[PDB]
């Protein structure tokens, strides 16, 4: 809401959304905030500008030329001409709901900017252009120089809007006539909604088990007038609405169905139909094979359904108990399931009120939808080895080999009576894989079947909308990709496959991690602070290294253990890593460098110090100070430029040392009031500080073994071990080295004063 | 212990405000008058993972809590339990919605505090502890994380979960709390069973240790290993750093030293602590009658102060950039800036528990071969 | 550890510093008492003193700040300089001895409404040798 897009800080076109046409907004505080921001930022003398740094109708830019060259330093600053359309929107916005004095003020302001033409009638000019001669004065005194009209002015849009506003203000028409749908009451709060939940038994054994513990339900039978089927049938049925053969129309394309669609009842040819929620589907992914996962998705869906429910009538949810919800012995339901049902009872579960009962009572009070469009108008040796051999590992290996070699769809002829295809055998493998709960090959066979998780694109767009840049693949580049814009489902899948290469399981792991990140972003959007770019491969490497350290095993053993880990355990590990909760300080520095958790104001301080020097060179590469006028601190390109400059070194410890030295240099620059006028090399600062620390430690009397040397960086590991603050921390040494370097390039005078 | 429907139709839930081990804090509004409150939803069932014995002990503990908060209600500096509701699965305790977080966030953000707010905070704490001791009620859980802050810098104690009544003539022999905040008596009682027990002296020790961590910024006693930490807690050799306590008055140091005393009998009480000159203040008085020697003394001290203020003013030293190159930790602003920046960079690694603490960031020891000698 | 009579003398002194009872020393009153004895600090100097004595920039001084600033142990050298400066203040006349008349002018400058008999009793009780003058040793031992 506050920003029109990721590139424009503010746009005056947001007024139309939050005014007379198409009222779609909530949290009126946001309305007031955006109105005040627009008034403070874009208001001028005879109107307002669309957005900052627009060069339309300017004495520069060479108007006969398009495709603006990247030379917008100051040639389009504070000279945006004007647009009275946002002014003429304000009078209507004020006169609509309850404002009168604002209406008179805006009308008085607008009458002064009017131009009288033929026959003496109001006429609204398009824009007022700055004179080509008085341009330097405006740069020092903005909104002070008079302007002249420029361009066409038969503006039908603004004139019609002004005429409509004047007619409405005259009192001839009421606000209730323009909108008969009553769209002016979108700011009225809705108190709450009660959710209804129905419980069914899959067979008689399940019903007996639930009645053992005191839960009374009815089986799938005994409700013959009512039928239940999954939601994919509902989607396939909906894929026939609005189809025409003469006009070449194929109807609605196939798409997934949310909880908001399955909650309501349906009527198909004088019958009652109910559809179960999508997240209890086991033929798509293995996410529904975990009970705690089912519980948390159920709680989230319950909260979401109770939140909006902008429909009429109470909702209805059906949660049948399947065979997979029992224990290992199959004689009782799991503890989590019985706890969830008991919490559903007594009318409080998750964050909503839950009322249970039977479908007979819920029929008289529930939303019903009437559908009318549905009315009638030697490989043989390998096969033998597969048949005779045992163990899931060998079976999976031989199936994968045969699928890659000759059997994408070829019949293995394993059964002389039934033609058993490779895909057929792979599918029936899931049946025995699910019973053992062996999370070591289910991912492998899922990679063979190339199963794709539904609703990935919405998760990706949700992650992108938070001003974050996503990344797929392991380093280094060009193999690293950068998805900066939303992509189609097929394009995203193929990009993921190309980034994943032939490792196969990497694609499934990346999809899983993306799902976890999307799920956790909504609930707690505060743990992603101090991070700008998300890289999946670095994350997986971090988890592998952490597991290897925890188990004190080899990398292969750590990867095998990570693959075996349950999805809930993977979520817990991801949460632990994200929360952040010799060998102690070095590990912290390595983790921080791997996740490059920069402070919240690093870029602003970098820009501020850059404003008082010619640049900051790192290992030959230099960042010129001329970039300060070509960009702004809020712009993403500056941030990615500094990140690209910083990540030249591969060692995370070096990156952290660089960050600390830059921060201490920015702090120290405040005390002095002078211009260095020279290139500052931070590696020299780090080396000088390390040498000073080495000399001090040698003076103290430490033996050589304590003051060791790194194999490929030249920095003592005890320096990495040193705490930041304190009288013996690295901060003091870095400050001393920075002061020495500054003195080395100073005109024999510091004149420090604060 | 009213029925749940009254709570359902009386208070309306809202967004989360905090999370805990097994409970979450959620804001609620009282429909008749639209006043805001904070509720504590406790799941006695514990998501179905609790054995019935654990469930029953949780209900008993919650009930004894509720009945111990009932009696203490009335003090303006204590939590007010507005309403309670009980079900077979949940407890709903309605409290006042304060505004901000605990003292932990304030201390982390401001690194160290000054004496101006410290005086008021510890005056309020001494008043509350004196009131509690008068009511023959002990708390034994005095922690910075158990104090909430208002918009007007108002603090009220909470988390009485470990509080219990003490019959006269009785001596408790139980061990609880984080290892940093035990007074020596609990440690001795844990090690040997022949000691009679402890009393309100543990509250005084907690007050002293929170004094020290509020002033210095780091706990007086902390070390990566537990058994040694217990050892030099037992020996009791708290020390003040050289370039850390060179800008503080002697009265506050004396009060702190009086607060922590190994002998339980010699420890200062709430009234004796409140009688200290550190809290001394005057409003108006005209009954000062005395001998001329005192008049000479007062005029002499007046002249002395009037001539000493100028000399104290002139004692300031310039920026001395050369000393900055030599040693920047000597200057107070430089040390403050370094500490603030270090806290800002690594402020996401300080949480509850003995594993991570504020003292882990500062390193005042001359790291050298002397680190070889750790213990026996 | 302080005692009750010391606190009484301290509050009497703090009341004497503040000519108008307000609860604060105030910049104007500090300037007035500075000029009364014969010194002219500038406004910048005065605000420097104010920000140095106070823990923040409120620009005001209260009772506990004076407790803190005069309960300090000044050792010997700095205390020796302070007592010499106090002596020189009391020694406006180049004689090196303190008489009843000099005390009279000093109290009048500080704003004390006393009488000749009171100051005579004061100097008689304070003096030990009975010569009518106070020596350095007597002054330093009295400073307790």
Give the one of C72, C82, C106 whose C-beta lies nearest to B311's C-beta: C82
Alpha helical stretches, state H, A672-729: 682-700, 717-721
Could you check whether the bond before residue A476 is cis, i.e. omega within 30 degrees of 0?
A: yes
Q: Do chains C and A touch (3 or more CB pairs under 8 A)?
A: no
Could you check whether the bond before residue A478 is cis, i.e. omega within 30 degrees of 0?
A: yes
Give the one of B48, B339, B343 whose C-beta lies nearest to A335's C-beta: B48
Q: Are B189 and B173 in contact (CB under 8 A)?
A: yes
Q: Which of A72, A88, A221 is nearest to A158 (CA)?
A: A88
Q: How far is C46 from chain B (nearest CA, A)?
A: 9
Q: Which of B43, B9, B3, B5 is nearest to B28 (CA)?
A: B9
Measured in residues, chain B has a length of 376
Q: How far is A489 from chain B (nearest CA, A)?
A: 34
Q: Please, which chains are in contact with A (at least 3 CB pairs closer than 8 A)?
A: B
Q: Which of A84, A129, A136 is nearest to A111 (CA)?
A: A84
B316 CB neighbours in chain C (<8 A) are 52
Residues annotated in a binding site of C for Ca(2+): 18, 20, 22, 24, 29, 54, 56, 58, 60, 65, 91, 93, 95, 97, 102, 127, 129, 131, 133, 138
Asked if C45's CB is within 8 angstroms of B307's CB, the reply is no
Q: Are A676 and A612 in contact (CB under 8 A)?
A: yes
B280 CB neighbours in chain C (<8 A) are 7, 63-64, 67
**Gap between the Cα atoms of A732 and A724, Å rounded:** 9
Apex CA A547: angle with CA A546 and CA A551, to 5°?
Answer: 120
Q: Is B254 a catalytic residue?
A: no
**Rg for chain A (alpha carbons), in Å?**
34
Measured in residues, chain C has a length of 144
B333 CB neighbours in chain A (<8 A) are 754
Give the one of C66, C78, C142 whose C-beta lies nearest to B296's C-beta: C142
CA end-to-end distance (rounded Å), chain B: 56
Q: Are A128 and A147 in contact (CB under 8 A)?
A: yes
Q: Are A460 and A510 in contact (CB under 8 A)?
A: no
Give the one of B249, B254, B291 whose C-beta lies nearest to C68's C-beta: B249
Q: How far is A585 from chain B (nearest CA, A)?
A: 10
- Exposure pattern of B39-75 as b/e (b: 16+ CB <10 Å)? bbbbbbbeebebeeeebeebeeebeebeeebeebeee
Q: Which of A297, A230, A229, A304 is nearest to A260 (CA)?
A: A304
**Gap between the Cα atoms of A230 and A241, Å rounded:** 19
Q: Which of B41, B43, B116, B49 is nearest to B83 (CA)?
A: B41
SS3 sequence, A93-120? Answer: HHHHCCCCHHHHHHHHHHHHCCEECCCC
Inter-CA distances, A739 with A252, A394, A727, Å:
69, 66, 17
Q: Please, which chains are in contact with B (at least 3 CB pairs closer than 8 A)?
A: A, C
B328 CB neighbours in chain A (<8 A) are 732, 735-736
CA closest to C103 among chain B residues: B296
Q: How many CB pairs under 8 A join B and C?
A: 114
Asked if A725's CB is within 8 angstroms of B89's CB, the reply is no
Q: How far is A191 from chain B (nearest CA, A)?
A: 9
**Gap between the Cα atoms of A134 and B201, Å rounded:** 80
**Both tokens assigned to A279:** 């997240």
A511, A517, A519, A524 alpha-carbon torsion, rounded to 10°: 180
**Chain B contact probe: residue of C6, C7, C8, C117 with most B CBs at under 10 A:** C8
Phi, psi of A505 (to 5 degrees): -60, -20
Q: Please, which chains are in contact with C (at least 3 CB pairs closer than 8 A)?
A: B
Residues annotated in a binding site of B for ATP: 17-25, 40
Whether B325 and chain A come into contact, CB under 8 Å, resolves to yes
Q: Are B38 and B13 in contact (CB under 8 A)?
A: no
**Gap between the Cα atoms of A720 and B253, Å rounded:** 36
Asked if B4's CB is within 8 angstroms of A348's CB, the reply is yes
**Gap between the Cα atoms of A403 and A386, Å rounded:** 13
**Gap between the Cα atoms of B300 and A398, Å rounded:** 103
Q: Are B156 and B78 in contact (CB under 8 A)?
A: yes
Written as one string, the DSSP assignment of A419-486 is --BHHHHHHHHHHHHHHHT-TTTHHHHHHHHT---TTHHHHHHHHHTTT-EEE-S-SSTTS---B-S-
Q: How many CB pairs under 8 A join A and B?
A: 118
Q: Which of B98, B183, B105 is nearest to B141 (CA)?
A: B183
B368 CB neighbours in chain A (<8 A) are 697, 700-702, 706
Neighbours of B331 (CB within 10 A): 17
**Gap between the Cα atoms of C2 and C71, Å rounded:** 9
A576 CB neighbours in chain B (<8 A) are none
The one catalytic residue in B6, B83, B96, B141 is B141
**Gap between the Cα atoms of C59 and C56, Å rounded:** 8
For the four alpha carbons of A130, A134, A136 and A142, in that order, the dihedral sign comes to: negative
Asked if B364's CB is within 8 angstroms of A726's CB, the reply is yes
**Gap between the Cα atoms of A207 and A209, Å rounded:** 5
Asked if B369's CB is within 8 angstroms of A701's CB, the reply is yes
Experimental method of this PDB entry: cryo-EM
CA closest to B5 among chain A residues: A347
B247 CB neighbours in chain C (<8 A) are none
CA closest to C32 among chain B residues: B306
To which residue do tokens 């984080």 refer?
A: B178
Written as one string, the DSSP assignment of A541-563 is HHHHHHHHHHHT--HHHHHHHHH
**Both tokens assigned to C144:** 């307790």
**Both tokens assigned to B124:** 């309020």
Apex CA A334: angle with CA A331 and CA A339, to 5°?
Answer: 130
**Both tokens assigned to A748:** 């024999």
**Gap between the Cα atoms of C104 and C86, Å rounded:** 16
Q: How far is B218 from chain C (nearest CA, A)?
A: 21
Q: Which of B188, B217, B5 is nearest to B110 (CA)?
A: B217
Written as one string, the DSSP assignment of C21-45 is -SSS--HHHHHHHHHHHT----HHH
**Gap between the Cα atoms of B38 and B101, Å rounded:** 13
Q: How far is B337 from chain A (nearest CA, A)?
A: 8
Strands B90-95 and B35-43 turn out to be antiparallel
Q: What is the largest CA-CA distance in chain C?
A: 50
Asked if A739's CB is within 8 angstroms of B333's CB, the reply is no
B369 CB neighbours in chain A (<8 A) are 701-703, 706
Q: Are B213 and B185 in contact (CB under 8 A)?
A: no
Residue B185: its H or E element:
helix B184-191
**Both tokens assigned to A56:** 């339309």
Asked if B249's CB is within 8 angstroms of C56's CB, the reply is no
**Gap between the Cα atoms of A336 and A339, Å rounded:** 5
């Amino acid at each position: 809401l506050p920003r029109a897009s990721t590139s424009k800080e503010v746009d005056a076109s947001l007024l139309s959304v939050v005014s007379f046409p198409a009222f779609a907004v909530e949290d009126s505080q946001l309305v007031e905030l955006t109105k005040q921001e627009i008034i403070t930022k874009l208001q001028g003398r005879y109107g307002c500008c669309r957005f900052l740094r627009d060069g339309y109708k300017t004495p520069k830019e060479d108007p006969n030329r398009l495709y603006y060259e990247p030379a917008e330093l100051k040639l389009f600053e504070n000279i945006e001409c004007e647009w009275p359309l946002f002014w003429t929107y304000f009078i209507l916005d004020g006169v609509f709901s309850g404002n009168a004095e604002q209406v008179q003020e805006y009308k008085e302001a607008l009458e002064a900017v009017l131009i009288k033409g033929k026959n003496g009638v109001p006429l609204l000019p398009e824009l007022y252009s700055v004179p080509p001669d008085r341009v330097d004065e405006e740069y020092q005194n903005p909104h002070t120089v008079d302007r002249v009209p420029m361009g066409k002015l038969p503006h039908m849009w603004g004139q019609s809007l002004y005429i409509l506003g004047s007619l409405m203000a005259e009192g001839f028409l009421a606000p209730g006539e323009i909108d008969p749908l009553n769209r002016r009451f979108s700011t009225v709060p809705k108190p709450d909604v009660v959710v209804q939940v129905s419980i069914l038994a899959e067979t008689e054994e399940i019903k007996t088990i639930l009645k053992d513990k005191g839960i009374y339900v009815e089986t799938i039978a005994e409700v013959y007038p009512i039928r239940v089927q999954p939601a994919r049938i509902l989607s396939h049925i909906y894929s026939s609405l609005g189809c025409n053969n003469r006009m070449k129309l194929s109807g609605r394309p196939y798409r997934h169905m949310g909880v908001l669609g399955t909650s309501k009842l349906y009527d198909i040819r004088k019958t009652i139909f109910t559809f179960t929620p999508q997240f209890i589907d086991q033929q798509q992914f293995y996410l529904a094979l975990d009970n705690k996962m089912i519980v948390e998705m159920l709680r989230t869906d319950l909260s979401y359904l109770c939140s909006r429910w902008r429909m009429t009538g109470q909702p209805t949810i059906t949660f049948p108990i399947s065979h997979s919800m029992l224990d290992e012995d199959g004689t009782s339901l799991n503890s989590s399931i019985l706890a969830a049902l008991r919490k559903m009872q007594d009318g409080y579960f998750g964050g909503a009120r839950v009322q249970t009962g039977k479908l007979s009572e819920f029929l008289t009070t529930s939303c019903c939808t009437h559908l009318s469009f549905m009315d009638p108008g030697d490989f043989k040796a390998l096969v033998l080895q597969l048949k005779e051999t045992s163990s899931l590992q060998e079976q999976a290996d031989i199936l994968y080999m045969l699928y890659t070699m000759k059997g994408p769809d070829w019949n293995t002829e394993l059964y002389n009576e039934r033609s058993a295809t490779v895909r057929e055998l792979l599918t029936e493998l899931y049946g025995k894989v699910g019973e053992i709960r062996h999370w070591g090959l289910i991912r492998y066979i899922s990679g063979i079947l190339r199963k794709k998780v539904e609703a990935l694109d919405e998760a990706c767009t949700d992650l992108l909308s938070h001003q974050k840049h996503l990344t797929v693949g392991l380093p280094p580049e060009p193999r690293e990709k950068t998805i900066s814009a939303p992509l189609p489902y097929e394009a995203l899948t193929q990009l993921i496959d190309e980034a994943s290469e032939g490792d196969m399981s990497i694609s499934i792991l990346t999809q899983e991690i993306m799902v976890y990140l999307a799920m956790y972003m909504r609930t707690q959007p505060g743990l992603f602070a101090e991070m700008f770019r998300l890289r999946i491969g670095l994350i997986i490497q971090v988890m592998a290294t952490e597991l290897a350290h925890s188990l004190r095993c080899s990398a292969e053993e750590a990867t095998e253990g990570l693959m075996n880990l349950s999805p809930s355990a993977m979520k817990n590990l991801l949460h632990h890593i994200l929360s952040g909760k010799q060998g102690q300080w070095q590990r912290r520095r390595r983790l921080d460098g791997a996740l490059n958790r920069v402070p919240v104001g690093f870029y602003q301080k970098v820009w501020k110090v850059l404003q008082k020097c010619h640049g900051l060179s790192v290992e030959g590469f230099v960042l010129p100070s001329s970039t300060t006028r070509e960009m702004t601190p809020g712009e993403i390109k500056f941030s990615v430029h500094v990140e690209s400059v910083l990540n030249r070194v591969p060692q995370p410890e070096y990156r952290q040392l660089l960050v600390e030295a830059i921060l201490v240099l920015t702090m120290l620059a405040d005390i002095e009031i002078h211009s260095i006028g020279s290139i500052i090399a931070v590696e020299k600062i780090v080396h000088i500080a390390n040498d000073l620390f080495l000399q001090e430690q040698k003076t103290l009397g430490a033996d050589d073994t304590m003051l060791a040397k790194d194999p490929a960086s030249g920095i003592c590991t005890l320096l990495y071990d040193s705490a930041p603050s304190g009288r013996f921390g690295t901060m003091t040494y870095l400050s001393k080295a920075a002061a020495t370097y500054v003195q080395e390039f100073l005109p024999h005078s510091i004149c420090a004063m604060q | 212990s009213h029925s749940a429907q009254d709570f359902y139709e009386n208070y309306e839930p809202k967004e989360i405000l905090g999370r805990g081990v097994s409970s979450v804090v959620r804001r609620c509004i009282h429909k008749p008058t639209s006043q805001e409150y904070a509720v504590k939803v406790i799941d006695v069932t514990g998501g179905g993972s609790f054995s019935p014995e654990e469930v029953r002990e949780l209900r008993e503990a919650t009930l004894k809590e509720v009945d111990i908060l009932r009696k203490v209600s009335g003090h303006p500096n204590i939590i007010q339990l507005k309403d309670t509701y009980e079900t077979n699965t949940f407890f709903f305790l309605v409290f006042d919605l304060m505004k901000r977080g605990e003292l932990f966030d304030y201390l982390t953000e401001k690194v160290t505090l000054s004496e101006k707010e410290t005086r008021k905070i510890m005056r309020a704490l001494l008043e509350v502890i004196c009131t509690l001791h008068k009511l023959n009620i002990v708390h034994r859980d005095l922690k910075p994380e158990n104090i909430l802050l208002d918009d007007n810098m108002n603090i009220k104690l909470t988390d009485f979960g470990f509080s219990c009544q003490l019959e006269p003539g009785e001596r408790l022999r139980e061990v609880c709390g984080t290892p940093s905040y035990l007074a020596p008596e609990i440690i001795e009682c844990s090690m040997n069973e022949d000691h009679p027990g402890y009393g309100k002296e543990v509250d005084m020790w907690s007050t002293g240790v929170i004094m020290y961590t509020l002033l210095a910024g780091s706990p007086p006693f902390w070390h990566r290993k537990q058994m040694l930490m217990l050892r030099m807690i037992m020996s009791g050799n708290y020390q003040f750093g050289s370039p850390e306590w060179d800008d503080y008055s002697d009265t506050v140091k004396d009060l702190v030293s009086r607060f922590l005393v190994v002998q339980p009998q010699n420890r200062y009480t709430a009234e004796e602590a409140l009688a200290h000159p550190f809290f001394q203040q005057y409003l108006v008085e005209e009954v000062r009658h005395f001998s001329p020697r005192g008049k000479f003394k007062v005029i002499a001290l007046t002249v002395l102060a009037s001539v000493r203020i100028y000399y104290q003013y002139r004692r300031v030293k310039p920026v001395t950039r050369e000393i900055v190159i030599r040693d920047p930790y000597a200057l107070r602003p430089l040390r403050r800036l370094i500490d603030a920046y270090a806290f800002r960079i690594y402020g996401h690694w300080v949480k509850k528990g003995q594993q991570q603490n504020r003292a882990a960031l500062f390193e005042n020891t001359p790291k050298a071969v002397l680190l070889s000698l750790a213990e026996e | 550890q302080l005692t009750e009579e010391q606190i009484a003398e301290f509050k009497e002194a703090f009341s004497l510093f503040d000519k108008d009872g307000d609860g604060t020393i105030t910049t104007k009153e500090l300037g007035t008492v500075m000029r009364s004895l014969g010194q002219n600090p500038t406004e910048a100097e005065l605000q420097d003193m104010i920000n140095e004595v106070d823990a923040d920039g409120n620009g005001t001084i209260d009772f506990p700040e004076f407790l803190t600033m005069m309960a300090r142990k000044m050792k010997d050298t700095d205390s020796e300089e302070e007592i010499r400066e106090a002596f020189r203040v009391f020694d406006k006349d180049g004689n090196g001895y303190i008489s009843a008349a000099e005390l009279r002018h000093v109290m009048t400058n500080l704003g004390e409404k006393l009488t000749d008999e009171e100051v005579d009793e004061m100097i008689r009780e304070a003096d030990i040798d009975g010569d009518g003058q106070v020596n350095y040793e007597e002054f330093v031992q009295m400073m307790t």
